[PDB]
Amino acid sequence: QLVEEELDRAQERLATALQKLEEAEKAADESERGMKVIESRAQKDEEKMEIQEIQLKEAK
Amino acid sequence: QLVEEELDRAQERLATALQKLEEAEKAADESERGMKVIESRAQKDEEKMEIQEIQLKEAK
Secondary structure, three states: OHHHHHHHHHHHHHHHHHHHHHHHHHHHHHHHHHHHHHHHHHHHHHHHHHHHHHHHHHHO | OHHHHHHHHHHHHHHHHHHHHHHHHHHHHHHHHHHHHHHHHHHHHHHHHHHHHHHHHHHO
């Protein structure tokens, strides 16, 4: 009766939470992806910077 | 009793849903923190290496 109506309410909250968790998982994973690619860029540009400044020293 | 067991088990399940959502969004937050700090790092490193390559070419 009303108890099964409560069941339906609980399960619809459940489904809403499932959609939410799917969105959150996608967001977190893509965020980690961006994180790793930017870390790679930072390391490589730091290496380029150091070699450039050493060459500048030699040139001076 | 089938309705009541569905009710209470789905209640524990929505509790699990909320807690896994919370940990997922916390992982999202820490990922965003890593992202923003490495964005700052990439920015400063790139601007520095640009200035340095400019200074090297001018010195040459």
